[PDB]
Structure 1
Amino acid sequence: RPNRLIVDEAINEDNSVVSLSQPKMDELQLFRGDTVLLKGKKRREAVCIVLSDDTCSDEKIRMNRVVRNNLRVRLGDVISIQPCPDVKYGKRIHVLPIDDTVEGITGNLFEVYLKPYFLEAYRPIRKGDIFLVHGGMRAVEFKVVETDPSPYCIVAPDTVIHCEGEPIKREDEEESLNEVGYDDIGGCRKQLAQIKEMVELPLRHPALFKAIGVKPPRGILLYGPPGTGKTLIARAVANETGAFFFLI
């Protein structure tokens, strides 16, 4: 059943790509780069782009933190897909930057950190979508407010993208959970995978641990030379799983 799949960490990213397996994409009815129309959890969907790599195993779907945070999905969750290989263009795409990411940088953000991403990168353009572009020495992110096609659109120069205005505040009702995550952890992939397999279930699934009975690790003693990322990996495995992180 290609409708539902369990999410996983992506490696290609591109701020937009969702990776499947061709032996599985055939069941998903996507071949080369067709639109995915990713279905989220609460009340949103993303167009996304289909691609493949080695780590699929025909079992899991991979999405970078841009999509995961856009769809309100934490790594390790289960989501749905609504494949639709169709092309439809928009004309009133309007975008505004996020104050949490623009709070002292001022300029032609339509040109300075936007040109190399609004075409040929296939941004998950859809009303309410939030995407990071990684511009000039800061992870500047934007939100596309209006997209007159939906939930999918062609990201191409034929589609019209309009200039932005003053920055808007981030949604504190959800906080967007930007912080950090697995995508900005490098050099300890094996250790991060060990911590993930060690801590994901008790944090994501506290319900079963009151019934399953077996005790999970009450505490995990990360250690290493100073500045190795212990705090970084702890905060990543906290935010990435949605667990509240209390630094003492």
Structure 2
Amino acid sequence: PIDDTVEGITGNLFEVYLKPYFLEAYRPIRKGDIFLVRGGMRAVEFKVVETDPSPYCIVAPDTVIHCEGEPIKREDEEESWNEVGYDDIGGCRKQLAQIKEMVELPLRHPALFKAIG
């Protein structure tokens, strides 16, 4: 688990979050993946630190899931827990599209504006 995302939770996280997430879903996963699971009026994050076979596999009914060890530090990883994104915004598609266009070049391609007047 990623430490900040399980603070204030107690109990069996595996049974509550990981089992339903993977159950008969045959999810493909890769070593180094960070994934988000929702339930219980919160969201928790986990990191895939190893797989066998390596470095990716399908999590199948026979797959054993190990969860023992030192929790991951959220500051050491790139993830979106509790960060708002466009997926958190409903019912103003056209206004958001306008704003996206307005900021695309200055925020995503800033070097452009030392080339052009």
Structure 1 pair 124–191 and aligned structure 2 pair: CA distance change class (3 A):
farther
Distance 1:126 1:172 in 2: 18
Q: 1:118 to 1:169 in 2, by over 3 A?
A: same
- When residues 109 and 179 of structure 1 are mapped into structure 2, their CA distance, relative to the original with a 3 A threshold, is same
| RMSD, aligned CA | 4.4
Q: Distance in 2 between matches of 1:198 and 1:134?
A: 33
Tell me if structure 2 keeps the 8 A contact 1:110–1:164.
no
Give the drift of 1:119. Answer: 3.1
Task: Determine the C-alpha separation between the residues in 2 that align with 1:117 and 1:205.
Answer: 38
SS of residue in 1 equivalent to 2:35 = strand
Equivalences for residues 1-248 of structure 1 within 5 A:
97-165=1-69, 167-172=71-76, 179-211=83-115
Describe the shift of the 1:100–1:123 C-alpha distance in structure 2 as closer, same or farther (beyond 3 A).
farther
How far the C-alpha of 1:205 sits from its partner, in A, is: 0.3
The TM-score with structure 1 as length reference comes to 0.41
| Residue 148 of structure 1, CA deviation | 2.4
Classify 1:181/1:112 alpha carbon distance in 2 versus 1 (closer, same or farther; 3 Å).
same
Aligned residues of 1:113 and 1:136 also touching (Cα < 8 A): no
Shift, 1:135, TM fit: 2.0
User: TM-score under structure 2 normalisation?
Assistant: 0.81
Structure number with greater CO (CA < 8 Å, separation at least 6) is 2
Instruction: Determine which structure has the larger helix proportion and give its number.
Output: 2
Q: Distance in 1 between matches of 2:67 and 2:39?
A: 17
> Distance in 1 between the 2:74 and 2:80 partners?
7
State the alpha-carbon separation in 2 of the partners of residues 181 and 210 from structure 1.
29
Q: Tell me how far apart the structure 1 counterparts of residues 61 and 68 of structure 2 sit (CA, whole Å).
A: 17
- Taking a change above 3 Å as real, the CA distance of residues 192 and 121 of structure 1, as seen in their structure-2 partners, is farther
Q: How far did residue 98 of structure 1 move?
A: 0.6
CA distance in 2, matches of 1:177, 1:145: 18
**What are structure 1's unaligned runs of at least 5 residues?**
1-96, 212-246
Counterparts of 2:96 and 2:106 in 1: how far apart (Å)? 16
